[PDB]
Amino acid sequence: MKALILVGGYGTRLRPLTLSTPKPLVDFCNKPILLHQVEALAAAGVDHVILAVSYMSQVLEKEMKAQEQRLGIRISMSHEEEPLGTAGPLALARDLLSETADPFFVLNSDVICDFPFQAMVQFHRHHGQEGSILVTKVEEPSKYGVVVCEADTGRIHRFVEKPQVFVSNKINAGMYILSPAVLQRIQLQPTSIEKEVFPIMAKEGQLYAMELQGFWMDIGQPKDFLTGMCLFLQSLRQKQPERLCSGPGIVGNVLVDPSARIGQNCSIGPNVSLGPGVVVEDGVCIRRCTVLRDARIRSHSWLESCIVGWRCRVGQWVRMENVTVLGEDVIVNDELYLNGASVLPHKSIGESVPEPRIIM
Amino acid sequence: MKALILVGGYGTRLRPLTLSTPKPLVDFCNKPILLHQVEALAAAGVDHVILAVSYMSQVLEKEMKAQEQRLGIRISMSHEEEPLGTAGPLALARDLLSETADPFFVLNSDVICDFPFQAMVQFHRHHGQEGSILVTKVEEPSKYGVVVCEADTGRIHRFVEKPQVFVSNKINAGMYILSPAVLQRIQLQPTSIEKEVFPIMAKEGQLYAMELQGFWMDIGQPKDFLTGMCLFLQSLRQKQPERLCSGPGIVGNVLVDPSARIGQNCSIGPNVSLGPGVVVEDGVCIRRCTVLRDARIRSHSWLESCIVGWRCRVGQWVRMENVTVLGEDVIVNDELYLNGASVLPHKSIGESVPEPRIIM
Numbered sequence: 083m084k085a086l087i088l089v090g091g092y093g094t095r096l097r098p099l100t101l102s103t104p105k106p107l108v109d110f111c112n113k114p115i116l117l118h119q120v121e122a123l124a125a126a127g128v129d130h131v132i133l134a135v136s137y138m139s140q141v142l143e144k145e146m147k148a149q150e151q152r153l154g155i156r157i158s159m160s161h162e163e164e165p166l167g168t169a170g171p172l173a174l175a176r177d178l179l180s181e182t183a184d185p186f187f188v189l190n191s192d193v194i195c196d197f198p199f200q201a202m203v204q205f206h207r208h209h210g211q212e213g214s215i216l217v218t219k220v221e222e223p224s225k226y227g228v229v230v231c232e233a234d235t236g237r238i239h240r241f242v243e244k245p246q247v248f249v250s251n252k253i254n255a256g257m258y259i260l261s262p263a264v265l266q267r268i269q270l271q272p273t274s275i276e277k278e279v280f281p282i283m284a285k286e287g288q289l290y291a292m293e294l295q296g297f298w299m300d301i302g303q304p305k306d307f308l309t310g311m312c313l314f315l316q317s318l319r320q321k322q323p324e325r326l327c328s329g330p331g332i333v334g335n336v337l338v339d340p341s342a343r344i345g346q347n348c349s350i351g352p353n354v355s356l357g358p359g360v361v362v363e364d365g366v367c368i369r370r371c372t373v374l375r376d377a378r379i380r381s382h383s384w385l386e387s388c389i390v391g392w393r394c395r396v397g398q399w400v401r402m403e404n405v406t407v408l409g410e411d412v413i414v415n416d417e418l419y420l421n422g423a424s425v426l427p428h429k430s431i432g433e434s435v436p437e438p439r440i441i442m
Numbered sequence: 443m444k445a446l447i448l449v450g451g452y453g454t455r456l457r458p459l460t461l462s463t464p465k466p467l468v469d470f471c472n473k474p475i476l477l478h479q480v481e482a483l484a485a486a487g488v489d490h491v492i493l494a495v496s497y498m499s500q501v502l503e504k505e506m507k508a509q510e511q512r513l514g515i516r517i518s519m520s521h522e523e524e525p526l527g528t529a530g531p532l533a534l535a536r537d538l539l540s541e542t543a544d545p546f547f548v549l550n551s552d553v554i555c556d557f558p559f560q561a562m563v564q565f566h567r568h569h570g571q572e573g574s575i576l577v578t579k580v581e582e583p584s585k586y587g588v589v590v591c592e593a594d595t596g597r598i599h600r601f602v603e604k605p606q607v608f609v610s611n612k613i614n615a616g617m618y619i620l621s622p623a624v625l626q627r628i629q630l631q632p633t634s635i636e637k638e639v640f641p642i643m644a645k646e647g648q649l650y651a652m653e654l655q656g657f658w659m660d661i662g663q664p665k666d667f668l669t670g671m672c673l674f675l676q677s678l679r680q681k682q683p684e685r686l687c688s689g690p691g692i693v694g695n696v697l698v699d700p701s702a703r704i705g706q707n708c709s710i711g712p713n714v715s716l717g718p719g720v721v722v723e724d725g726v727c728i729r730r731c732t733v734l735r736d737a738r739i740r741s742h743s744w745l746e747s748c749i750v751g752w753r754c755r756v757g758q759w760v761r762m763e764n765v766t767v768l769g770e771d772v773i774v775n776d777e778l779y780l781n782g783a784s785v786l787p788h789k790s791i792g793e794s795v796p797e798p799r800i801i802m
């Protein structure tokens with residue numbers, strides 16, 4: 083029983099945080115998102131997880147080394163001297179997938195959702211064919227590829243990976259189960275699975291469609307990070323009300339790390355996740371924001387729908403709103419108004435930005 | 443000796459403040475604008491003052507006779523039916539100035555400066571002509587009437603109401619002394635004094651000029667009101683350093699009324715005048731602003747180059763900048779941003795203003 087994760091890649095959409103660390107390694111509610119996916123695969127029970135590293139590949143490999151001994155599950159990397167796309171890692175790991183005649187999971191690392199994994203392999207055993215997709219309805223189609231879905235069998239009549247304005251509402255949830263019979267069709271050259279093998283596979287009608295229960299979201303865009311974090315905090319309050327912090331100054335659904343410190347006389351708005359090692363001073367209001375690790379936020383400041391990078395210092399009386407992303411080790415001077423600014427790492431801002439723009 | 447102050451002008455430039463209370467009654471460094479002038483006229487030793495205001499406002503009619511026994515000098519007013527310009531007040535009040543053969547003072551209500559009234563009056567007694575003006579050098583002469591001064595004879599060759607050709611650098615500063623004789627040049631019919639009667643007086647040579655010493659500023663405009671306040675605070679620091687409030691949480695030239703209450707752990711920036719009865723909470727940073735009376739500013743908020751009207755309640759974590767003006771009885775919700783927003787009285791605001799505009 084082996085599962086595949088397309089880790090790495092460039093991650094060009096989440097850019098001001100992915101300049102410093104790779105996209106699977108960024109902290110989504112005090113844990114990396116790849117860590118969430120491998121907790122799900124370890125909870126389902128998988129001996130071997132194959133993982134492809136096309137990016138930095140030091141500081142992604144050492145964390146997998148460390149996490150193998152905490153999970154107790156054997157992990158493998160495959161990497162490549164050139165980017166094989168998202169299809170080509172199947173052809174690279176074809177032998178280590180081919181020695182066992184088991185169906186294998188295929189996951190995108192940016193996807194966070196409730197994980198239907200072994201209900202999905204029961205679905206795959208029921209219909210009996212080679213390829214199963216996950217499908218979730220999403221309001222805007224053009225973000226993510228769309229499938230045509232029928233009633234009982236769920237056989238996909240027609241596939242298209244880049245949607246038109248009104249072609250369909252059901253979106254590919256980016257989570258697949260592939261048999262060993264499909265890697266004989268894939269080639270060694272760098273291709274992309276979401277467009278090459280799915281169109282030709284949709285010609286035969288071997289693809290079937292598994293629905294999802296709830297809160298499917300990608301974290302690839304920096305806005306999508308925030309709304310997916312809000313959805314995950316809601317569903318975490320559903321499942322584990324224990325874990326969310328309750329306090330008199332805390333309103334809504336707030337997740338605080340133990341090493342994080344909250345100064346008194348301050349309000350924490352809804353849907354806020356505080357990383358490990360942060361310190362929030364007296365009289366700070368922060369709503370719908372994600373603060374990563376070791377970040378200091380000074381007194382009398384207001385932050386709303388923002389992402390604060392690692393080792394960031396926010397001055398006093400700073401107002402940040404509208405998806406202002408701060409890179410790693412960014413120092414913000416006091417009495418500044420940031421609206422919509424994505425700030426590149428190791429930068430300091432002298433003056434306020436009134437409009438959304440990228441600060442180099 | 444008599445003195446005529448021109449008030450008029452319900453809607454000249456201080457508009458959200460004048461919607462509630464007439465222009466000479468609003469507070470400028472914890473004193474009304476008229477009260478600065480009539481205190482300087484008491485220091486001049488004038489015997490009777492008369493204000494010509496084209497509207498009968500009942501509250502100021504209470505105020506003047508309430509003031510005149512502390513002042514020691516009787517105060518009268520003169521009301522015209524339709525506004526006769528700025529000369530018609532002198533023509534309508536001709537009898538009170540013509541009954542005694544002494545020079546009389548003419549003032550504008552918006553002009554505030556150090557008033558050199560004994561030096562001015564002697565200067566008029568020494569030169570002995572029909573009218574003496576006070577001029578001052580300003581960087582931009584376009585807004586003001588600009589005189590040409592002869593060297594050491596203070597005689598004015600030319601008086602133009604407006605420039606547009608840069609006749610000179612020195613401007614009329616709103617300070618006239620007029621003889622009884624020039625009473626018969628004016629007519630009861632509506633006209634304007636600085637447009638009409640000064641030019642033909644300067645053609646003869648009866649107009650004379652004296653240059654002020656320091657910090658002339660108009661406070662007609664609200665943007666001009668703030669810089670006039672910041673300039674008066676520095677000159678008042680030179681004159682009365684012990685009147686200006688000093689403290690560890692207080693930075694720069696700050697004038698605090700003893701009834702005002704300032705909370706703990708907050709930094710009052712430079713050039714800030716607080717009204718009587720204001721309440722400043724914890725962590726409020728106020729720079730270059732003027733807070734009128736009974737106005738409460740809640741905690742953790744930042745205000746910079748702003749005017750706060752009477753009986754105002756400002757929410758927490760609010761950021762106000764770019765010369766914003768609140769009218770009377772204005773309540774601002776918490777976590778808002780006001781940039782350039784001029785606000786009408788008795789209006790509550792529940793949205794942030796991104797750009798300068800007027801809110802009704």
Ligand SMILES: Nc1nc2c(ncn2[C@@H]2O[C@H](COP(=O)(O)OP(=O)(O)O[C@H]3O[C@H](CO)[C@@H](O)[C@H](O)[C@@H]3O)[C@@H](O)[C@H]2O)c(=O)[nH]1
Nearest residue numbers: 088089090091134136165167190191192226227254256276
């Ligand atoms: N090793 C390797 N991995 C890669 C490469 N390119 C992409 N990957 C992995 O492939 C996954 C998807 O890549 P994206 O480029 O972020 O995909 P997308 O534009 O968001 O669209 C795809 O994902 C959506 C769901 O997240 C799908 O809905 C959509 O149809 C499509 O499959 C990511 O986790 C990334 O790590 C590569 O060149 N090399």
Ligand SMILES: Nc1nc2c(ncn2[C@@H]2O[C@H](COP(=O)(O)OP(=O)(O)O[C@H]3O[C@H](CO)[C@@H](O)[C@H](O)[C@@H]3O)[C@@H](O)[C@H]2O)c(=O)[nH]1
Nearest residue numbers: 448449450494525527528531550551552586587614616636
């Ligand atoms: N009674 C009455 N008084 C008036 C009227 N109009 C103006 N006043 C008063 O006359 C003074 C001048 O009015 P403004 O219209 O505001 O003049 P300005 O644009 O500021 O220019 C004048 O004053 C400048 C200094 O403040 C001068 O530099 C300039 O030469 C000019 O005289 C103010 O005190 C105003 O209250 C009126 O129609 N009737």
Ligand SMILES: [Mg+2]
Nearest residue numbers: 192300302303
């Ligand atoms: Mg993606």
Ligand SMILES: [Mg+2]
Nearest residue numbers: 552660662663
């Ligand atoms: Mg003016």
